[PDB]
Amino acid sequence: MYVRISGRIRLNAHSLNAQGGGGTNYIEITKTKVTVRTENGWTVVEVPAITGNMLKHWHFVGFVDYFKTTPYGVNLTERALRYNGTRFGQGETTATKANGATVQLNDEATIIKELADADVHGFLAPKTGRRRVSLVKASFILPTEDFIKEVEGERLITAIKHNRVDVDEKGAIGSSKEGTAQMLFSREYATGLYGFSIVLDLGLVGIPQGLPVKFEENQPRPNIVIDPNERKARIESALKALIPMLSGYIGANLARSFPVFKVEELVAIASEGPIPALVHGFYEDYIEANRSIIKNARALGFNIEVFTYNVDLGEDIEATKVSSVEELVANLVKMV
Amino acid sequence: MYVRISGRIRLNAHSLNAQGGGGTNYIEITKTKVTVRTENGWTVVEVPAITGNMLKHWHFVGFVDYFKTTPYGVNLTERALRYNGTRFGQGETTATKANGATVQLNDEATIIKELADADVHGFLAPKTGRRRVSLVKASFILPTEDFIKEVEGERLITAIKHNRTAQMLFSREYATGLYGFSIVLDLGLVGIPQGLPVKFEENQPRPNIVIDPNERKARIESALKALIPMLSGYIGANLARSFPVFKVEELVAIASEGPIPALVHGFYEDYIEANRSIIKNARALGFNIEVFTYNVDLGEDIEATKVSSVEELVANLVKMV
Amino acid sequence: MYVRISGRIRLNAHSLNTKTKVTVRTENGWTVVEVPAITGNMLKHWHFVGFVDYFKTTPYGVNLTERALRYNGTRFGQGETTATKANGATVQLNDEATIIKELADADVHGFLAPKTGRRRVSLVKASFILPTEDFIKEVEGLYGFSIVLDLGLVGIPQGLPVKFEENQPRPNIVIDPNERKARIESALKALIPMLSPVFKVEELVAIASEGPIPALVHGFYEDYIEANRSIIKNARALGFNIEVFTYNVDLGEDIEATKVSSVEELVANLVKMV
Amino acid sequence: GWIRNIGRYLSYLVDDTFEEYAYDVVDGIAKARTQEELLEGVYKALRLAPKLKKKAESKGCPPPRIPSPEDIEALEEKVEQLSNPKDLRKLAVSLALWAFASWNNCP
Amino acid sequence: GWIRNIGRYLSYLVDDTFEEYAYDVVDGIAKARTQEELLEGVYKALRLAPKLKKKAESKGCPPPRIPSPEDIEALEEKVEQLSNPKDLRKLAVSLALWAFASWNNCP
Amino acid sequence: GWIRNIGRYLSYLVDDTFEEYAYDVVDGIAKARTQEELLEGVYKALRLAPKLKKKAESKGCPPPRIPSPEDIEALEEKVEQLSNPKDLRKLAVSLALWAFASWNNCP
Amino acid sequence: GGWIRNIGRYLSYLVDDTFEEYAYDVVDGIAKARTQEELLEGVYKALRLAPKLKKKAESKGCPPPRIPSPEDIEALEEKVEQLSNPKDLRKLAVSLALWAFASWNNCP
Hints:
It is classed as rna binding protein. By secondary structure, chain A is of the alpha+beta class. Helix content of chain A is 22%, strand content 20%.
C-alpha cells in the first residue's frame, strides 16, 4: 500500500504550530519563505506554515487511537498510550509495553514485532545503535502559489490578544508584587488555502530493515515476522489514521483554536509496488502535473489506482470519484 | 462518549469578545482575516469574531453551573466556584477544593479524583509539571461565507457611544450577522488519567476509570448539559448591557462511543453537502454514529432525527449514555 | 431565582442618545439594514432607577448609596476607595461581603471599584430594543425586547457562594434572609415601570425557575412564539420546574401557563411564589 | 538625529512599566518591504498615543514623548524620495533597531 | 501642500481639551481603498465642524481652523487622477498619520 | 568600549544556562556583507532582549545587560559611512567575536 | 602577552584526537592570515565551534575545553587594531596558529 495523497485544504482561523515564544506574552505562528514566479522574476515571501514534524506526530496519534480498538492493540509502547511523541530516549536500553512488559532494544525484528508505533513510524536507539526509517513521511503545509500570489500583500496573520483573568478569594485582581499569575498572552491567528502531500510506504510494515527480503530457494519472499492478520490490522489502522487528519485534528492549540477546516480538493494513488512520489499540491498547476504523471504511469506497467475528490483529472484516466475522506479510506482498505 | 456539534447561529446586535481599549475610551470587537472564494479568486476580509477561548470559558462556566446541583458537587476547585478561569497558575503547587481541604498536585490521578474542575477542561501546573489535555475544543465564531458573499463590505459594525470629574464618553463597537460555530467534546477520557488510560489486567484493553462510575456519568451529563446556556445567549462578554440577540438557525450533531471524524465547520457555504458524505460514509465504514438535525434537511439514507430545539439534543445525548 | 422575559411593544418617539446594523430575514439573500434602536444600557439604567424607587419605600431601604438616591447610577468610579450610604455613613471598599450588607444597588446591579480592584457581576442583564423583522418587512413602530433577571445570587458574594459546613451546598447569605427576600421582591417589582412614552405592551412571555434555565429566545424574531413554546415544552422534561406566564399569546395545548391580562398582575404572580 | 526622538516613543510600547508588549507593530515596521507597509506600520505604532497618555500618570510615570509634528515632515520627505527596496529597508530597520533598548523611563 | 490644514482638522476631533472624540472617521480614513468610501469618510469628518465650532467658545480658546473651501476642492482633482490603489491609499494613510502629534489645539 | 557592551549582550544568546540557542542571528551578523544585512541581524539579535530579561529571573541569574540607547545611536552613524565591504566585515566580525567568550553570565 | 598560549590551547582542540572534530580549514585559514579582516574571520570560525567541543567533552569523560576569556578577546582585538602591516601580521598569525599542533594533555 505505497499510498500517496496530495491536495488543497482551506485552513481558516488557525493557530497551529506556533513558535513557542519562550513563555512570554507574545507567541507567533512559525513562518517560512517560499518562492513564487509572479511573472516578473522569482521572489521569496515569508508566510505561515505547518512543519511536517507536527503532521507526522498527529498521524502517530491517529494511528495509536485507531489501533487501540483493534484486539491486536496490546503490542503498543507504554509511552505511546499517553500520545507521547518520543520514541526512544537518549540513553535508555529497555522499553515498556502497554501491559507493562519489558522489550529489549537489540535485534529490531523483535522490537517491531512487539511494538506497533515504533514499527510503523520508526525509532532510534542511541545506545545499542538500532534504527528504522519511518514508513510514513509528511511534507510541509504551505499556502498555495495561486493564492499566495493573487493576494498581493494581505499579511493574513492578525495577532488576536487574549489574556487570563485571575481573582483571589476576596475578588481582587492584584498587582505584580503579589503575582496573581496574570499574563497578556498574545497569539497569532492565520488563514489561507494550503496544500499537503503526505506519503505512506506502508508495504514494508512488520518487516525488519536488516533483512527486508528472505531467500528460501533463490526466490524472494517478504520477511513478515508478525502474523499476517496483525499486519492487516496495522495497515487498516494506519489507513484509518488519515480520518482524524482531514477533519480538523492537526496542529496545536486545539483546545482554543480547532481550525475551521475543509478539504478543497485532493488526489490519492494506492498501487502495489514502488511508485513515483506524487507532487505537492502547493503549485498551481499540480493537477496537470498529476494528469501527466498517472496517465502515462499505467503505460510503464504500474497498477496505479487513483481516487480523486473535486479534481477532474481528465476523462481517459480511470479515476474513482470519491465524495469524502473516510470512504476514500474505505476504498483504500478494501484492497488491504 | 464523543460528540461533535456544528451549525449556524444569528448573533444580532452583539458586542461579545471586544478587543478592549483599556485606558482609552474606544472599545472595538476583535478582528480576524478570513478567505472567501468570491468570483475572481480568493480574497481576504477582516471580520468580527469570537475567539475559541471565549466559548471554551463560557462552556466551563455552564459546566460548573450545572455541576453544582449534582450531589457530587463538592469535587470542585475553590476557583471554579467563582468562575475563576485559571486552572493552576505559575507558582502554586496545591489546589483549594470547594470544601476547603487542600489537594496535592504531585499526581494526575489524585487531581482527577479530588476535583472535577481539571477533568473536563484540562489543566497545567508548571511547578510540578503536571498537564492534562482539555476534553472540550471550540473553534472561532466567524460570519459564514454565504453571508459575507452578499454583504459586500460596509464593515458589518457600528460604533455607539455611552456616557456616565468622572464624566467621560466611551464608544463601543457592535456587530451582527449569521455566524458559524462548531464544538467538539471528546468526553471519553473523563475521570481517566492520561498517563495510564488502560489497565490491561487479563491482557485485554480495560478503561482505567479512577472515580466512581456513577460520578463519571453525572460529570458527563453535566458536561453535555453545559451546552444548554451556550445556544441560548450566555456566550461572550459584556452580557450586562448587550445580551446578544440569539437564535440558532441550523444545527447538526453527531454522537458515538468510539473515535469519529470531526464534523466540518458551519462557516463554509456548502458544509451541508460535505456533511452528508462525511456522515453517510463514516457510518458505512462501521461507526456507531447517532445524528440529530435541527432546521436542516440532509436527505434520506441517513437515520437522522429531525428535531426542533437544543435541549432535546442534550436530553437524547444524556439518555444515550 | 431566575426570571426571563421577552416580548414586543409598540413604541413611538424613541429616546436614543444610535442606529445599529441588523440582518433581516430576506430569504432571497441575507441583507443588513440600519434601524433606530434603544441601547441596552438605557434599559439597565431604567431598571436601576425603578429598583431604587421601589426599594426606598421598603422599611429596610436604608442600605443604599447617596448616588442611588439621586438616581445617579454611576456606581463606583476610578479613584474611589470608599462609598457613602443613604444615611451618610461611610463604607470601606475592600471586600464584596462588607459592601453587600450595606449596598442594595451594588448587589442587584453589580459593581466595579478599580482602585481596590473589587468586581461583582451584575445580576440583571438587558438586550437592545430592536424593531422586529415582522414590522420591518412591511416598511422596507413595533419593537422586540428581552430582559434577564439572575436574582439567584442576591446578597450572595461571588467569592464564597457556598460554605460546606458538613459537605453540603448551602447558600452563603451574608445578610438578613428577610432583608434578602425584601430586596428580591423590590427587584421583581422594579419591572412595573419598565412596561409603562406612549408604548403599550402587545405580546409578552415570561419564565421563572428556582434552578438555572436557558435564556429565553429574543422576541425580535418573527418566529419567537414557536421557538419559545418548543423551548418550554422541551426543557420541562429535562428535570427543571418552570413557571410560564403569557400576555395575550397562546403557546398551544398540552402545556400549563397562567394567562395574565396586565403586567402588574404578572409581577404579583411572580412575587407571590417567592 | 531626528530618529531617536521617535525611537523613544517606539520603545515606550514594548517595554515594562507600561504593559503594552505590542511586538506586532514593531516587527511590521522593521520587516517592511514597500513604503506603504512602512507607512502602515508607523501609523499603527503612532495610533496608540491616547491610551499611553493618561495611563502613565495613573501608573506614576512621566508623560510619554510623542514625536514632534516637525519630524513627521522629515520622515515623509525621506520616504517620498526612497523608492528602492535597499535604502527603504535600511531606514525601516534603523527605525526600530533600539525599540528594545534600555531607555530609562518612569524612574 | 494642502496637507497640514486637513491634518489639523482631523487632529481637532481626537486631541484633548475637547469632548467629541470620534475615532471612527480617523480610523476609516486610514483604511480607505476606493474613491467613493474615501470621499464619504472625508465628508463625514467635515460634517463634525459645526459641533466643534459651537463648543470652541465653551472653553475660551481660539476656535479650530476649518480648512478653506479651496483646500477641500483641491482634493477632488487630486484624487480623481489617481487610479492605482497603491498611491490611492498612500494619501489615505498619510491623512490619518498627520492627526497624531503633540502641538497645542488652542490655548 | 561600545563594542564590549554589545558583545556582552550578544554572548547571552549562546552560553551555559539561558536555554535559547540562537546561532542564526550570530551567523547573520558575522556573515553580513552590506549595511542592511548587519542592521537586520542586529535587530534580530535585540528582538530577543525581552526574552533574556524574562528568563533572567526565571532561573535566578542576574538580569541581562541590555545595550544602552547611546551605543546603538552612535553605532548607526558609525555604520553609515562604510562604502566598502572590507571595512564592514571587520566591524561585523568584531561585533560577533565576543558572542563565544567565557563571560560570567550566571555567577 | 601570554594570551597567545591561552587561545592556542583552545585552538588545539580542533585538531587533536578524542574529539572527532577535524576542522583543518579554520586552522589553515588562521595560519594563512593575509590581512586582519579574514584573520578575525578565521578566529570567529574557530570560536563558532566552541559549543560543540564544550558539550561533547563532558560526553566522553574529559574536562571541558578552556574557552578563552573575554580578556583574551580584548587583547586580540587591540593587537589587531594597531597592526596595519603584513610584516608583523604574518608572524602574529603564525604565533597562535602553531600552538594548534601540540601534545596537550586534554584527556588523562
